[PDB]
Design a protein around this ligand. Structure first.
Ligand SMILES: C=CC1=C(C)/C(=C/c2[nH]c(/C=C3N=C(/C=C4\NC(=O)C(C)=C4C=C)C(C)=C\3CCC(=O)O)c(CCC(=O)O)c2C)NC1=O
Length: 209
């Protein structure tokens, strides 16, 4: 079981076409294992891919998923990182992540946040509407309706533009940026080893570099 289940359900209710097209990894690790990784690639109409990583151990529950739309409509990706770190500490992040470097994207009517957060440069693959909240595991679903508004706006963008391009190099700047700045490598090395951490980051999470 996972505390992120209602986010995950909402995601695939909005985009029921996103079917698993490859289980990229199911790995065991952590203490003898207590940490499990599931890494799925999904495909479906209007998307290049959605890649979904879910890492669960006794204290942590991390759901990191990015939807990469087909190209040709200048659409942002939709990214979420739902991170339970301990039984006291959760960070919820989701946003429209635009592939063009240093382009400030926004959707009018959505919550706005111009604060600066760790690791990342705001305005550069994160939008005016980046949604970041810190709360306790049992509070996570209080932002679910907002997550669902983001999904609703995203689905309108997809359905109104109907992108059909498949130029994965549109996402190369984005994947490069997400690679240098995301704090993953360290956590996965410790839990799973070096080769697995490297491949997870470079060949699964951000593979369009
Ligand atoms: C898979 C394993 C995995 C690990 C181990 C991980 C760790 C991780 N991500 C973080 C932050 C963050 N991560 C993001 C955002 C994202 N990052 C993304 O990969 C995507 C897709 C988004 C958003 C759509 C942001 C904005 C922060 C900073 C949060 C903050 O400022 O505290 C932090 C810092 C938390 C803190 O400030 O205390 C850690 C430790 N992220 C992972 O994905």
């Amino acid at each position: 079981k996972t505390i992120w289940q209602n986010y995950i359900d909402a995601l695939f209710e909005t985009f029921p076409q996103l079917e698993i097209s490859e289980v990229w990894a199911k790995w065991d690790g952590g203490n003898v294992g207590d940490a499990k990784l599931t890494a799925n690639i999904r495909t479906g109409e209007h998307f290049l891919k959605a890649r979904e990583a879910h890492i669960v151990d006794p204290n942590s529950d991390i759901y990191n998923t990015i939807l990469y739309p087909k190209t040709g409509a200048d659409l942002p990706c939709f990214g979420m990182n739902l991170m339970k770190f301990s039984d006291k500490k959760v960070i919820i992040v989701f946003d429209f992540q635009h592939p063009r470097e240093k382009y400030l994207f926004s959707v009018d009517g959505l919550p706005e946040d111009d604060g600066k957060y760790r690791f990342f440069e705001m305005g550069n693959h994160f939008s005016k509407n980046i949604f970041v909240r810190y709360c306790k595991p049992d509070e996570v679903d209080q932002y679910l309706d907002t997550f669902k508004l983001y999904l609703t706006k995203y689905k309108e963008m997809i359905d109104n533009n109907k992108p059909v391009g498949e130029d994965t190099t549109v996402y190369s700047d984005f994947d490069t940026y997400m690679t240098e700045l995301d704090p993953v490598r360290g956590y996965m090395k410790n839990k799973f080893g070096e080769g697995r951490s490297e491949a997870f980051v470079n060949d699964f999470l951000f593979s369009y570099k």
